[PDB]
Structures are given as C-alpha cells and as structure tokens.
Backbone:
C-alpha cells in the first residue's frame, strides 16, 4: 500500500519523505553506462 | 511510545485541530509506514485538550528549573486562567 | 617572602561558580608565572586535543604550584609554594586516597577523568581543571601504567588479528589499591611528547641492555632449579631462550665492576627521569581534620 | 638499506633466510591511497595450503634506493616454506605480505620472481652488528636488479649482495602451481553460496521487497530500472575479485573482538571498483541515530548495489532504492579458522 | 507534478521470479572467462620470468667457452 507525493524537507522521523530521503538517480547517465558496459561485456566473451 | 506535547496558540479550537493535523502530518505517515494499523482501534492519532487561556502579549517567558544536580530549560507562562476541556481527537 | 598572590579576573564570577570554587578551597593549582587564561591546567589540557598526560605533566613539572585559599567574586587569591615552608593541604579530591602511612604526596594531572577536577568558568571563556594529589607509589604506578598503555595500544592495534583490544583495558584496568579499585582514563594515541618520553626511555633501555651482569643469571637459574620462589611466579618454572643463551659464557670479576658502575650512573639517570614532577614530603598528617602538612621536597 | 639489516637479526627466529627488496611507489600506489602504510609476512602454499605463523617485517618508506633511476619504498620477504633443507625451491609459490601503518593494502609475490632475480643480480666491549659492517662495504650498483612482477605488471627491485653464508647458500638452491587458483575459487564459492541463500530467501517468500531502509522512490522506478533488472545482481558475483578487502570477511575477523555492521558496495554497472570493507558504527557518540544517518545515506545511493554483513552471522543485500533481501552467512567453521589464520591469529 | 511513492515497508519490488536463475549462470560464464584471461596473462609473465633463467644459465655456460 503505497502513496505518491511531490516533496517535503528534513525530518527527524526515519520513515518520512524529504529531500534528504530522495535517491539521486539519473536515467540517462546510467543507461549510457549500461549500454557501453554491455558492449564491454560483449567484448569480454570473445577473448577466450 | 506516546508523547505529551504542549502547544500555545492564539486561535480557535476549529483552527487548532486543523493546524495540529498539519503539524503532525509527517508523524502520522511515519506511524503508518512503520506499522500497518491491522485492527480498527489503531487509527486514532491521539487527542488534544485546551488547558485554558492567558494573555497573548506577556505569555511564555523562558526560565530555568534547577534541581540539586542539573537544570533544564522550562517555559513559564504567567497569569494562567486554567480551564480544562474534553479530548478532541486528532486523526 | 610573599605568598598572597591575587589573580585578577576580567568578568563577574557568578554565584553558580562561587559555590563550587568555595567548595575547592585548600586544593593545589599550577601557576603561569595575573591574566585569566594560563592560570590552571585548561590552557594545556583542552577538549580539542587528546588527553596525553605528558604535556600537561610537563606543564605541571616546569611551572610551580599554588594553594587556593580564598575565592572572592571578580578576583581570587593564590598562595605559592616556596620551599622551606610548611603548607597545609586538605584532601578535597573526588577519587579519595586515604593517607594512612603519610608518604610523600605527589601532584598528577586528572587522569581519573576531567569531570571530577574541572570547574566551569562562565565568567571568562576558560575552563580550569585541578591537578590530582596522591601519595608517591600510587603516582609512580599510574605513570608506569599510562606509559605501558601508551606504548601497547599501538602494538595491539598493529597486529592484524586484533581479537583482543579490550584485554589491556581491563588488564591495566583500574589502579592497584587494596580498599577500592579506581578506574582511569586511557588515551588511544600517546601524542607527541609522550612518544618523546618513550623515545628517551628506549634510548636508556637499549644503552643499558648493552651491559648485563651475568652473575644474577646464574642465581635465577639456580632458583629455577631450586624451589619456585613466589617472586619467581612470573616465570612459572620456565627458562626462556634468552636467559638460556646469555649463559653460555663464564662468570668473572673483571666485567662486573664496570658493568655495575655504569649501571649505577644510568640508574641514577633513570631516577632523575623518574623524579618527575614536583613532590611534597609529608610530616604530621592529622587525619581527624584531613590536613597534610608538607614542605616542598 | 636500513630495513635490510633491521629485520635480518629479528626475523631470524621465525625464518632462516631473509630477502632484501624494493617496491616502487608507482606499483603499490593502487594498493593504498596517499601512501598511508609504513608489515606482516604470511606465505601460503601452492599444493600444501595449510596455515602458517605470521612473521613481522620492518619496512620504512620515503627513503630512496642507491639508484637515482627510481625512488620507492623498502621491504623484506621471509622465506621459510622449504622444509628442512632449503635446497629445494617451490615453484609457482606465492608469498603474501600485510604492509600497514594503522592494516591497509596487500602484496602477493611468487618465489620464482624472487629467486630467479636473486641469482640474476649477482671490562666489556660493545656488541657490533657484524651484518651492518659487512653490508656497508659493498654499496654498489649491481646489488639491485629489476624483475617484472607477474601479479601486477611492474618491475620489482630486489637487492641481494655477497654478504654471508646465509645468502651464500641461497643462490645455490634449485629444484624441479594452483596457489592463486584456490583463493579465487574459494571466494567465488562463498559468493555462490551467499547468492543461493538470497535465492532461497526470495523463493520461500514471495518475490517481494521488505525495504528495511526507508527512502522515497519515483514513479518511473520500473521504467528507468527495467522489469527484473537484476543486471547488477547478475554480475555482482563477477565483481567480487577481492575477499580480504571485502566486508564479507570483516564480520569474521570481528567476532572475537562486539558486533557492528559492514558494507560491500559496488557501481550499478562498471562505474569503478568502488569500495570494500567499511564500518557502520554504533560505538562513538554519533550513536544509533548517527548510524541510521549513514544507513539512509546508503539506501539513497541510486547508482550502487550494496551488500551488508553483520558480525553475528547474518547477511543482507541492499538494492539501490532501499529494497533489501535477508539472508544467512553461516558456513563450515573450518573455513572460519581458515580465514582467521589467513588474516592473523586464531 | 512528478509523483514519488512514499517509503512504506509494504512497498514491494517489481516481482522477480525469472530474474536470477539465468543471471547467476551467465555471471559464472563471464567469471570463468575473466579467470582464464587472468590466468593467461599470469602464464605469459610466468613464461617470460622463466625464460631469462635458461638464458642466464647459457651465459654462465659461455664462461667455459672463453677458455676453450
């Protein structure tokens, strides 16, 4: 049972949304890294 | 565990339950997120009660309370007119 | 011979501190030479540094001491320690030490916690911690225990299998006393001047290890071969490799004189390195009013 | 050459023959940041795995070789694997060091890289260090020779010199594999059994998250992390090349001294060999709320997987996103004693 | 606005039964490749450290050449 919220800021309470309880994700940078690392993984198979 | 907080306000009871719900807005979802209210009686987020009135100008002068060993800060409301009321639940 | 040395403050000593300062009357305080900072031990023992008990011991041993006699508001008076005078000292220290045998009293920094000998001065931005007074043998074993911890914390940390760091914290543990055991404060890093003291001690140790008297080796080998003395109980009837291998040679009369002569001069140098800090010889300590009359030994 | 005659009369108790060596600063800079160490010898066997006592090696840094060509740190390696007569050499036989100041960084060296270059390079009085007087008169260039290192592809200088019979027997020795083959297979074995424990804990439960650590999550979490995107959870087991730096062994070394938490954190996909073997502290006055601040700063890491080990025998894997999967740590206590002797004393 | 699911401990991951059993197998398939590539470069430097030994032995045998 989740609930969806835009924002808050700075609690002492552990289970309480915030800007400090927000995970700093970037979808673009991780996808490029993945796409390039996948290419590296593919090149890793064909040395043996 | 439960908590006993004290609130000074210059507003009405109709105002005080709305603004106390807004003040406790992180704490209700905190208690909900850590523990699901599996039964019907765990919904009540406590209650409030008016302890009476005092003057809004020279209210709540800060002071200190000294025991033999230590000293904590304590507010000092002066010239209080005590008037209790029944419990109004917060949710 | 002047003794009445006032120390002028610069702010109002409030009545929360006048009570505990009048509580500490008859104690001992170190001097700077007054100014509000540098009169005490908080100038060299602050909260920012590690409690090293050597640099503050150096400040206790370099500069002279003083008895606190009266604390007024805005100013307090101090009474110096010039020799040849009999000073009366009350035991007003929170780790109590009963002066039954009335040995030579000895100053120490508060190694039993800052909190018992501190006084909070909120008049000026300064905190004053009182030195600890206690008889000589307890003081010397506190010195040996704090240097043993200051040399052994690093070498217990230096082992990769540090399954026992807490072994020394209870093995050293309290101070050795019959009526009660008194735990002390233990610093993890010995700091600069503590390591300089261990460096000079290692200098002296490795110089005297170049000359060992071989004659006592034969006597301790015989006492191992004879009945186990209770002073020999640290060996538990074992001959280690070193004492077994320093006794392949013979015993003569030639080496022993020069050996014991340089051991005389180096042990007198080690006593001079252990005559450390100002001490007070005590005569006629009256227990019923807890006053130990002392002159500066 | 100060450390050469500093542990030649001290390590002679635990070891017959002692080798003098150099490490360049460039090769060991990736072992430790900012040159923080300033050692512990533990030579492990190829076919005769066992466990051996730890020998101490006195090394001092910041002091150059006699050569001005390269400037690096000093070291020494004990050789005590050869039983009885040391005329036999064990080939493909590692020697592992634990150099340290405050235990940080590890070094592994073959005996073959050591020994092939060692033959290639060629009323009292006070006591005198006869080795120190004999060392001082050589003082020449050709005592030091550069030898490539098979683990890390750099030249490792050894200094040997016609000193005495102890090195004199050394170059006359010759004799007629599997030593790094075991440690990788062992670590991947315990990693496979940990991932199998996580597999059965996700299997006996529903395929769901309990989310021990709270953190807010966006609506696009099933988009920007794809459906069943366990690419990191796939490749986690390939990414654990080290164990003795890992937090997996930090729980086992801390059972005897009480119980804190340890973290192995790795990049979602090759963002760098991130971090291995850190502490979550409840001891200092940061306290449990200070540890909780570190744990929510851990769960908010959106670009790293996390693995948690407790000292009391429990293992956790924290996904980026605050999700977690519980698991078990318990293994056969022979391998507990094996790791405990690999690090230090039992 | 952008909506963020608030942290409750009933927040489930997106359900993953099929995710891991092929994942560990392809992980070990890449792991064996990593290991024998490292073993290959180990054996390359291992043959280069042994090769100078037989050349040093031959240059030691070249001593007896100089008196013949």
Residues:
């Amino acid at each position: 049972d989740p609930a969806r919220l835009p924002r808050d800021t700075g609690p002492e309470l552990m289970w309480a949304p915030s800007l400090r309880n927000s995970l700093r994700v970037s979808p673009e940078a991780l996808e490029l890294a993945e796409r390039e690392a996948e290419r590296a993984r593919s090149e890793r198979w064909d040395r043996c | 565990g439960p908590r006993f907080t004290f609130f000074q306000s210059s507003r009405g009871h109709c105002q005080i339950m709305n603004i106390l719900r807004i003040y406790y807005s992180p704490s209700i979802m905190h208690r909900y997120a850590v523990v699901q209210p599996l039964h019907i009686e765990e919904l009540t987020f406590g209650a409030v009660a008016c302890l009476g009135t005092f003057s809004a100008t020279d209210g709540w002068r800060r002071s200190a309370f000294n025991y033999r060993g230590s000293s904590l800060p304590v507010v000092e409301i002066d010239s209080f007119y005590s008037n209790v009321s029944d419990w109004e639940v917060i949710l | 011979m002047d003794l009445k040395v006032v120390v002028s403050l610069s702010s109002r000593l409030y009545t929360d501190e006048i009570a505990k300062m009048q509580q500490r009357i008859g104690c001992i305080l170190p001097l700077a030479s007054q100014n509000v900072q540098g009169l005490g031990l908080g100038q060299v023992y602050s909260l920012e540094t590690v409690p090293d008990y050597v640099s503050m011991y150096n400040y206790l041993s370099d500069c002279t001491l003083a008895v606190l006699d009266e604390v007024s508001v805005d100013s307090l008076i101090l009474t110096k320690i010039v020799p040849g005078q009999t000073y009366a000292i009350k035991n007003k220290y929170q780790p109590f030490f009963q002066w039954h045998g009335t040995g030579s009293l000895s100053v120490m920094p508060p190694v039993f916690g800052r909190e018992h000998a501190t006084v909070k001065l909120e008049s000026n931005d300064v905190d004053i911690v009182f030195p600890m007074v206690l008889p000589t043998p307890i003081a010397e074993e506190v010195l040996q225990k704090i240097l043993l911890f200051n040399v052994y914390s690093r070498v217990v940390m230096q082992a990769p299998g540090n399954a026992d760091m807490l072994d020394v914290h209870m093995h050293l543990g309290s101070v050795s006393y019959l009526g009660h055991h008194y735990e002390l404060a233990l610093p993890e890093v010995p700091g600069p001047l503590g390591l300089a003291l261990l460096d000079n001690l290692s200098l002296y140790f490795c110089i005297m290890v170049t000359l060992l008297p071989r004659a006592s080796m034969r006597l301790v080998r015989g006492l191992i071969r004879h009945e186990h003395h209770d002073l020999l109980n640290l060996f538990q009837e074992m001959v280690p490799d070193e004492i077994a291998r320093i006794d392949l040679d013979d015993l003569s009369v030639a080496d022993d004189l020069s050996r014991m002569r340089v051991m005389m001069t180096y042990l007198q140098s080690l006593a001079s390195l252990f005559n450390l800090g100002p001490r007070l010889a005590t005569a006629a300590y009256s227990q019923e009013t807890l006053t130990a009359t002392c002159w500066l030994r | 050459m100060d450390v050469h005659i500093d542990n030649q009369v001290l390590s002679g108790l635990g070891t017959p023959l002692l080798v003098h060596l150099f490490v360049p600063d460039t090769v060991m800079a990736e072992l430790c940041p900012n040159r923080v160490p300033n050692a512990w010898c533990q030579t492990l066997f190829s076919d005769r795995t066992g466990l051996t006592r730890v020998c101490r090696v006195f090394a001092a840094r910041g002091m150059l070789p006699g050569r001005p060509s390269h400037r690096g740190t000093f070291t020494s390696v004990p050789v005590y694997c050869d039983e009885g007569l040391p005329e036999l050499y064990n080939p493909f036989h590692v020697a592992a060091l634990r150099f340290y100041d405050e235990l940080v960084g590890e070094l592994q060296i073959y005996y073959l890289s050591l020994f092939e270059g060692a033959k290639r390079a060629l009323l009292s009085r006070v006591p005198v260090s006869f080795s120190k007087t004999r060392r001082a008169i050589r003082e020449s260039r050709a005592l030091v020779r550069g030898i490539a290192h098979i683990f890390s592809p750099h030249a490792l200088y050894v200094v040997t010199y016609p000193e005495l019979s102890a090195q004199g027997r050394l170059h006359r020795m010759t004799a007629v594999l599997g030593a790094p083959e075991r440690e990788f297979r062992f670590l991947i074995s315990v990693a496979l059994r940990i991932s199998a424990s996580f597999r059965e804990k996700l299997a006996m439960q529903a395929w769901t998250a309990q989310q021990e650590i709270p953190v807010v999550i966006p609506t696009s979490y099933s988009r920007i992390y794809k459906n069943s995107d366990l690419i990191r959870e796939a490749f986690f087991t390939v990414q654990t090349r080290v164990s003795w730096e890992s937090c997996w062994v930090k729980a086992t070394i801390s059972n005897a001294p009480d119980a804190c938490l340890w973290i192995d954190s790795h990049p979602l996909y090759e963002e760098g060999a991130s971090a291995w073997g850190k502490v979550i502290d409840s001891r200092p006055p940061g306290g449990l709320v200070g540890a909780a601040s570190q744990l929510v700063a851990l769960g908010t890491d959106g670009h790293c997987v996390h693995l948690a080990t407790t000292s009391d025998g429990q293992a956790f894997l924290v996904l980026p996103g605050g999700f977690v999967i519980k698991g078990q740590l318990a293994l056969t206590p022979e391998e507990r004693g094996y790791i405990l002797a690999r690090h230090g004393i039992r | 606005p952008e909506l963020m699911w608030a942290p409750s401990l009933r927040n489930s991951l997106r359900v993953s039964p099929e995710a891991l059993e092929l994942a560990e197998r392809e992980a070990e398939r890449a792991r064996s490749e990593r290991w024998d590539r490292c073993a290959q470069v180990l054996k390359n430097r291992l043959l280069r450290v042994e090769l100078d030994g037989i050349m040093r032995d031959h240059l030691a045998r070249a001593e007896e050449i100089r008196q013949d």
